[PDB]
Design a protein around this motif. Sequence first.
Motif, PDB file in Angstrom:
ATOM      1  N   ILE B  47       0.859  -1.174   0.000  1.00 16.61           N
ATOM      2  CA  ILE B  47       0.000   0.000   0.000  1.00 16.61           C
ATOM      3  C   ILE B  47       0.897   1.226   0.000  1.00 16.61           C
ATOM      4  O   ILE B  47       1.086   1.880   1.031  1.00 16.61           O
ATOM      5  CB  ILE B  47      -0.954   0.008   1.208  1.00 16.61           C
ATOM      6  N   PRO B  59       1.692 -13.117  -1.074  1.00 17.37           N
ATOM      7  CA  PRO B  59       1.104 -14.413  -0.718  1.00 17.37           C
ATOM      8  C   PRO B  59       2.145 -15.514  -0.689  1.00 17.37           C
ATOM      9  O   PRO B  59       2.342 -16.180   0.334  1.00 17.37           O
ATOM     10  CB  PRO B  59       0.077 -14.645  -1.830  1.00 17.37           C
ATOM     11  N   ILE B  63       3.788 -17.671   2.396  1.00 21.35           N
ATOM     12  CA  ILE B  63       3.702 -19.125   2.302  1.00 21.35           C
ATOM     13  C   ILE B  63       5.081 -19.748   2.456  1.00 21.35           C
ATOM     14  O   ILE B  63       5.314 -20.581   3.342  1.00 21.35           O
ATOM     15  CB  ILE B  63       3.049 -19.535   0.972  1.00 21.35           C
ATOM     16  N   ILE B 202     -20.753 -35.914  55.455  1.00 14.49           N
ATOM     17  CA  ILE B 202     -22.053 -36.175  54.843  1.00 14.49           C
ATOM     18  C   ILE B 202     -22.675 -37.485  55.301  1.00 14.49           C
ATOM     19  O   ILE B 202     -23.796 -37.805  54.874  1.00 14.49           O
ATOM     20  CB  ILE B 202     -21.952 -36.163  53.303  1.00 14.49           C
ATOM     21  N   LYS B 209     -32.726 -41.156  59.653  1.00 15.22           N
ATOM     22  CA  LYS B 209     -33.792 -42.062  60.058  1.00 15.22           C
ATOM     23  C   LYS B 209     -34.450 -41.599  61.347  1.00 15.22           C
ATOM     24  O   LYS B 209     -35.641 -41.846  61.562  1.00 15.22           O
ATOM     25  CB  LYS B 209     -33.242 -43.479  60.224  1.00 15.22           C
ATOM     26  N   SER B 210     -33.694 -40.934  62.214  1.00 19.80           N
ATOM     27  CA  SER B 210     -34.281 -40.431  63.450  1.00 19.80           C
ATOM     28  C   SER B 210     -35.000 -39.099  63.235  1.00 19.80           C
ATOM     29  O   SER B 210     -36.218 -39.007  63.419  1.00 19.80           O
ATOM     30  CB  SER B 210     -33.198 -40.291  64.523  1.00 19.80           C
ATOM     31  N   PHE B 211     -34.264 -38.056  62.843  1.00 17.51           N
ATOM     32  CA  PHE B 211     -34.822 -36.707  62.753  1.00 17.51           C
ATOM     33  C   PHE B 211     -34.772 -36.115  61.353  1.00 17.51           C
ATOM     34  O   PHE B 211     -35.804 -35.659  60.846  1.00 17.51           O
ATOM     35  CB  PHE B 211     -34.092 -35.777  63.737  1.00 17.51           C
ATOM     36  N   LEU B 233     -12.175 -16.652  44.722  1.00 14.86           N
ATOM     37  CA  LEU B 233     -12.493 -16.308  43.342  1.00 14.86           C
ATOM     38  C   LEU B 233     -12.087 -14.879  43.028  1.00 14.86           C
ATOM     39  O   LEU B 233     -11.529 -14.607  41.958  1.00 14.86           O
ATOM     40  CB  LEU B 233     -13.986 -16.511  43.086  1.00 14.86           C
ATOM     41  N   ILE B 237      -9.419 -13.695  40.204  1.00 10.32           N
ATOM     42  CA  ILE B 237      -9.684 -12.630  39.246  1.00 10.32           C
ATOM     43  C   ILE B 237      -8.617 -11.552  39.354  1.00 10.32           C
ATOM     44  O   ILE B 237      -8.184 -10.978  38.349  1.00 10.32           O
ATOM     45  CB  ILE B 237     -11.095 -12.055  39.461  1.00 10.32           C
ATOM     46  N   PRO B 244      -2.582  -7.090  33.633  1.00 11.28           N
ATOM     47  CA  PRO B 244      -2.745  -5.699  33.195  1.00 11.28           C
ATOM     48  C   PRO B 244      -1.687  -4.777  33.757  1.00 11.28           C
ATOM     49  O   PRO B 244      -1.479  -3.694  33.208  1.00 11.28           O
ATOM     50  CB  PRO B 244      -4.145  -5.327  33.698  1.00 11.28           C
ATOM     51  N   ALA B 251       2.583  -0.278  28.185  1.00 14.29           N
ATOM     52  CA  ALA B 251       1.996   1.019  27.883  1.00 14.29           C
ATOM     53  C   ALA B 251       2.999   2.131  28.128  1.00 14.29           C
ATOM     54  O   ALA B 251       3.071   3.094  27.365  1.00 14.29           O
ATOM     55  CB  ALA B 251       0.735   1.232  28.720  1.00 14.29           C
ATOM     56  N   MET B 254       5.222   2.061  25.209  1.00 12.74           N
ATOM     57  CA  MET B 254       4.576   2.797  24.137  1.00 12.74           C
ATOM     58  C   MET B 254       4.606   4.295  24.382  1.00 12.74           C
ATOM     59  O   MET B 254       4.676   5.063  23.426  1.00 12.74           O
ATOM     60  CB  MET B 254       3.132   2.326  23.976  1.00 12.74           C
ATOM     61  N   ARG B 405      37.739 -63.176  40.222  1.00 13.62           N
ATOM     62  CA  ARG B 405      36.418 -63.239  39.609  1.00 13.62           C
ATOM     63  C   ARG B 405      36.177 -64.597  38.961  1.00 13.62           C
ATOM     64  O   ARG B 405      35.060 -65.126  39.008  1.00 13.62           O
ATOM     65  CB  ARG B 405      36.263 -62.115  38.585  1.00 13.62           C
ATOM     66  N   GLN B 414      21.502 -66.975  46.518  1.00  8.60           N
ATOM     67  CA  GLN B 414      22.046 -66.006  45.570  1.00  8.60           C
ATOM     68  C   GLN B 414      22.173 -66.687  44.211  1.00  8.60           C
ATOM     69  O   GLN B 414      23.236 -67.162  43.803  1.00  8.60           O
ATOM     70  CB  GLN B 414      23.385 -65.469  46.057  1.00  8.60           C
ATOM     71  N   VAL B 416      21.259 -66.022  40.131  1.00  9.57           N
ATOM     72  CA  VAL B 416      20.941 -64.973  39.170  1.00  9.57           C
ATOM     73  C   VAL B 416      20.367 -65.600  37.908  1.00  9.57           C
ATOM     74  O   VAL B 416      21.107 -65.976  36.993  1.00  9.57           O
ATOM     75  CB  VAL B 416      22.180 -64.121  38.844  1.00  9.57           C
TER      76      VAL B 416
END
Lengths: 569, 569
Positions: B47, B59, B63, B202, B209-211, B233, B237, B244, B251, B254, B405, B414, B416
């Motif tokens: 432009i 374009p 691409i 809970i 059963k009683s009350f 909450l 937030i 910000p 800002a 800027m 060895r 023992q 293996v």
Amino acid sequence: DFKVYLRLISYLKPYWGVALLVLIGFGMNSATEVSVAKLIKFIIDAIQNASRADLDWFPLLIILLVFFRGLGLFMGGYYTAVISRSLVFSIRQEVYAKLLRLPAQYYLDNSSGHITAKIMYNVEQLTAASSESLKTIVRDGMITLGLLGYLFYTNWRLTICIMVFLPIIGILVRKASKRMRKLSMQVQDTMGDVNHVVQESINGNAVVKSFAGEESEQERFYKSSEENLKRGLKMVIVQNLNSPVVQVVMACAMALIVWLALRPQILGNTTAGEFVAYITAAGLLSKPVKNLTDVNEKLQRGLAAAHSVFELLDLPEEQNSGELKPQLQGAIRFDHVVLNYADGTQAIKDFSLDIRPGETVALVGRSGAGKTSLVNMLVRFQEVSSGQIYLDDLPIRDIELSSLRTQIAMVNQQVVLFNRTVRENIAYGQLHNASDEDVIAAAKAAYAHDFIMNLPNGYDTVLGAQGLNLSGGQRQRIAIARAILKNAPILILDEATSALDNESEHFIQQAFDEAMQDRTTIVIAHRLSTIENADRIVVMDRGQIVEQGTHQELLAKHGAYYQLHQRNF
Amino acid sequence: DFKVYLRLISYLKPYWGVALLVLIGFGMNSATEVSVAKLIKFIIDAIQNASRADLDWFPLLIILLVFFRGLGLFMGGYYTAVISRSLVFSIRQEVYAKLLRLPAQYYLDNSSGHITAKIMYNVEQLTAASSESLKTIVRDGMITLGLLGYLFYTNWRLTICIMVFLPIIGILVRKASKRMRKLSMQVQDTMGDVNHVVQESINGNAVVKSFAGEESEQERFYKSSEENLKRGLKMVIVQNLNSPVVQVVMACAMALIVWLALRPQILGNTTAGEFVAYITAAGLLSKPVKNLTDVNEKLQRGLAAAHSVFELLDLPEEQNSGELKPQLQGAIRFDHVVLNYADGTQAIKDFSLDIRPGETVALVGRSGAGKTSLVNMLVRFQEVSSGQIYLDDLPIRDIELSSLRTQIAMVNQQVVLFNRTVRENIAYGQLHNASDEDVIAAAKAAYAHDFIMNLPNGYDTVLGAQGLNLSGGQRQRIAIARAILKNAPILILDEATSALDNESEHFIQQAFDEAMQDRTTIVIAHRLSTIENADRIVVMDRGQIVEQGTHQELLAKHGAYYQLHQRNF
């Protein structure tokens, strides 16, 4: 599917204001996101000879824009989570209400209490996050609305072509990503089988003590594992490269833009900064749908529990088909109780029990064979499938629910210790309608007043951290006091499990015997004097009333029946 | 700190080409990211009246740019993960090498094998991800380099002011985010205590059963919980709004840009699309440091294991201070072994054991009291802190490591079992230097040839999935065959735990007795005939050699010593 969700929404139609505020906040966030590209277009305007006026504010423009966006996002998230918590609370309240007056097979058949409560909570959090993803979906939808609006404002036909070329490649990319993830999982498992095999074959110190030459063996195993690892790594890199397919899609979109530019119509239009804004927004649009894809994912993840949750909410209701009878005299006769363990055959069949009015009688027999089942049947956990259960000159159902609940009592292992005040635990029913003088009298009747009440606050002794200030014997004494203090017309308890091994056994037994007077109840007592002082007895065999007769004859027999009743075989 | 890392880097200096390719790929990715904003600047150029030539390619420009970026990112990730896997493999190889010839206290004192192997693997993956985050850090650093380069190309002094105002607010935002996260955790715990308390109260069906009146109680508990939830909450937030603050920082950046514009120097400069590119890149820069912050986080997370990993890698080395002696005749005498459980007192003190050359002798005594410890000492798990351990007319250390060895053997628990070929398991040492005729002869000597070899592939029977085709008795027979087939000069085994409860006990015992001929070994045999056929015996008490003498006298005593030796008390 969303019937319970719609019910909760109808309830929160009282929170219509909250919902409107939440929608306003989400829309404000979307409007701010649109204004991002909007003001971005204004930036280039500064670079057009004389534009100096807006140049200074541009800083303040971006600043206050970010401020407003943060404000809106904060308010939306706040009210949204508020609504979520309110929904959780209301759902929990309804869930408890359903749990109240629930059926026997809840706990009797399944692990209803702890497991189902945790399921309810998991589903609550799930549906909360589901509503949250729904709010994010609303944000994305408002964002798409803004994108389409800006598109219409700029160039309707160009936007139509853009939408045409759009979404299709996006869904293709979604499917490609799913397939790539599946292939990545397959290759990762293919490598990880050998990986785990190698990572699980390092033992054998004695083998090293003997020879210790497997270094090349480890090298070769790791070589094969590394070949599989190279395969998996190349696959992961390919997965990363798969997003370049979506890049190619956006490139075709840009090619459509370039073709629109090839039409001189765009040149005369000379979108310029507007075109920059359009491309920027299209990018912003990508984040919306990108987030939105997970919405259905977590939605199903939560619905996986929510469906069963709403089902249990609407589970088989305990039909309270009953009359309104205030009180009775004691003429209770249950006839032909033909029932056994649910979803099974009949074992306690025709378990008839007819009792004369007013008088108190006891039954003895085998300790097991469904004795607790018979107790629960008396507790109306089941019903006499046969016979006529006539009570108070009317059917068993022909009575008030409260009166049956009022007469409900038991002295067995079924003791409900509530971590609350000693006075609170003293009055199981209608505690707020109980006098303090009666409370002191019951505390005297507790048979453990010098011991159970020997704690902080005395009559106001709040049970501590899981009864941190209470012992087992004191807890049993307190429960016995709470039960005995109740002036129910008939506190019939199945006390076959009565034992004298607890502390203050003599005092507790004396208090129980004193309370037994002027109280019609069927209890298999353990005291020899109480057993010999019974009025009417029936010889129950195989877990059901099989024989009966005068209690004096059974007491004086002192034979096999007495030995079985006393020594419990 | 990074000594082992530097060692691995020196090793992968052989992978210098791989490293250079990885660096090239990361730099290419950064260059592509820079070119993003670069070409973005070119977009506005279209432009500007007549620019049509570049419009079409634009374009194709975007691409092919995305294509090149994907190519570079793919290559970088690929070679990087390749280097990571190679590092994992090399580290594992060195780790195994250290595990080879390791010290007794590894497994004897600690759960070295499984736990330390899993720690090694966790640390391997950790250091791999650490190198990966390091590569991401390299990408971010190259990105910052590109940002500074574009900044210098555009306006040196303006960029200086930008850097001045930059980074400081970013670190302030990092600290603010950390504090906000801590406050969020505190408030979340404050609410979640009550949340868990409510979600764990809970139960109590009998109470209903009683009350069944606690509906308002649940309402009130949920009300307090909801107050805490509203607090949390709002805190969340606020955490969202905290970004910000970073927006306000950008800002101010800027605003610095706007002040530079207030200087007419920028106007004459008229950055325009260049300014757009600069702001865009500054934004792109944000992602780099944003990612880079986690680098130290995961870096420490991995170093938490890597430090101990490199420590165990450089842990106390088993100093192989030994001569080179091919073989001996059998004149072994260990004198004054004063040692016990490590990091403790002395229990097996002056455990001297002098044996005549060539002849085979046995020792008997208490079953426990560190008998296995004495065996391990014979296995050179420890050393005689006193005395002179002269072997083959020279010190104990004055011998070849291989010969010790080679003579190393044992027939006890023992065992293996290597999940490999039966022929592979037959030759514990130098399997590739073993003849097939000798293999067949040993299989005949297996004492279970008709049973142990009665499986697929016969002499080539590969042990299946954890020996899926082998039973316990057959496995024991196979292990016995593997041990016996070895033609070691002295296969001294501590076989006090010998039992006849296994299958083919008679045949196995006969084979063991036959192999005992022409083999100097000290074994506490369980066969009565073998016990009576011993040459020299010593009466060991309290887990150490306390007495000795002629074996005939001890055999003929048949008193307390014989009863203790046979019945094992």
